[PDB]
Structure 1
Amino acid sequence: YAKKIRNLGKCAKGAGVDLRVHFKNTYEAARAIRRMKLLEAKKYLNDVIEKKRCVPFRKYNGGVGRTNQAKEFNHTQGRWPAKSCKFLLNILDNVQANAESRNLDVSKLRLIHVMVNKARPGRRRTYKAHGRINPFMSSPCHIQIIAREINISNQNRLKNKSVKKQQTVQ
């Protein structure tokens, strides 16, 4: 895991190996999540899967629409990536389970590190035009998540100068 931690007794990790979801959507979701209390994040994810609150697409925002929900995050564009959220939800659940297994109270857990990397793409073919084969690759991703429990030198001359200054001020 990419973080600096010090005390892993207070942390709960969780990963997804090679998730068959789009990196960009899931990245966006992760961004939306990060620095949330775990339960709140979970709630948010559930809302997005039932299309009630959007995830705002701020970085990878080419063509993404113009939802009414994005006002909540001071933004115009947003989406409700379902599959991505589901995958993320699963990994959140895993994290929660891990925390439980340890002695971490899930109320006090913050997502300190939600990392999404892109994984090696699965290759397929698409057929175009005048007998031209093109790639039709997935962009799967690795997800790492870390929840975490939360609550000179003087000198004589210099000294003299200082004293003088003080006197002057007085």
Structure 2
Amino acid sequence: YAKKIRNLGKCAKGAGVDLRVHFKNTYEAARAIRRMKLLEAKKYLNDVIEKKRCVPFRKYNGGVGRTNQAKEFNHTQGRWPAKSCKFLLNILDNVQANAESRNLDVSKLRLIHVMVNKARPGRRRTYKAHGRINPFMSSPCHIQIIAREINISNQNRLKNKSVKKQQTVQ
């Protein structure tokens, strides 16, 4: 994992190797999640899956609509990336399980590192124009998630000068 941890005893990690979900949506979801208690994050994910709360598309915001729920994050654009959300939820669950297996309280766990890297594209073919074959590739991803339990010089002359200054002030 990418993060500098020091003590892995208070941390619980979870990974997703090559996910069949779009890199951008998933990234957005991750961003939305970040710096949150694990349970709260899970709840948020659930809500998004049921189309109650949206994730704000702030980075990859090209063409994404203009939802009502985006006002919650001071933004205008937002979406409900279902499959991606589900994937993320699964990973969260895994992380939770891992934590349980150790000795970490799930209530005091915060997501300290939610990384989404883009995996190698799954190549497919699309057919265009005047007999033209074009790449119809997917954008798979790796997801890395880390949860964590959260609760000169003197100089004599210089000294003299300082003293003088003090005296002056007085």
Could you say which TM-score interval applies, normalised by the shorter chain? Answer: over 0.9
Per-residue CA shift, 1:138-161, capped at 9, x if unaligned?
000000000000000000000000
| Pairwise CA distance, 1:24 | 0.0
Structure 2 residue 163 is matched with structure 1 residue 159: no
The CA RMSD over aligned residues, in Å, is 0.2
Per-residue CA shift, 1:33-60, capped at 9, x if unaligned?
0000000000000000000000000000
| Pairwise CA distance, 1:82 | 0.4
| Pairwise CA distance, 1:163 | 0.1
Match of 1:136 in 2: 136
Name the CA distance, whole Å, in 1 between partners of 2:24 and 2:34.
15
Match of 1:56 in 2: 56
Per-residue CA shift, 1:85-143, capped at 9, x if unaligned?
00000000000000000000000000000000000000000000100000000000000
Q: Secondary structure at the match of 2:94?
A: helix
Per-residue CA shift, 1:7-54, capped at 9, x if unaligned?
000000000000000000000000000000000000000000000000
Aligned length: 170
Name the CA distance, whole Å, in 2 between partners of 1:141 and 1:61.
19
Query: Where does structure 1 lack aligned partners over 5 or more consecutive residues?
Result: none
Runs of 4+ aligned residues of structure 1 deviating over 2 Å after TM superposition are none
| Pairwise CA distance, 1:5 | 0.2
Name the CA distance, whole Å, in 1 between partners of 2:106 and 2:6.
20
Name the CA distance, whole Å, in 2 between partners of 1:163 and 1:34.
51
Match of 1:43 in 2: 43
Name the CA distance, whole Å, in 2 between partners of 1:52 and 1:5.
35
TM-score, normalization by structure 1: 1.00
Name the CA distance, whole Å, in 2 between partners of 1:66 and 1:122.
31
Name the CA distance, whole Å, in 2 between partners of 1:90 and 1:15.
10
TM-score, normalization by structure 2: 1.00
Q: Secondary structure at the match of 1:116?
A: strand
Query: Where does structure 2 lack aligned partners over 5 or more consecutive residues?
Result: none
Name the CA distance, whole Å, in 2 between partners of 1:159 and 1:105.
53
Name the CA distance, whole Å, in 2 between partners of 1:15 and 1:141.
11
Name the CA distance, whole Å, in 2 between partners of 1:158 and 1:129.
81
Q: Secondary structure at the match of 2:116?
A: strand
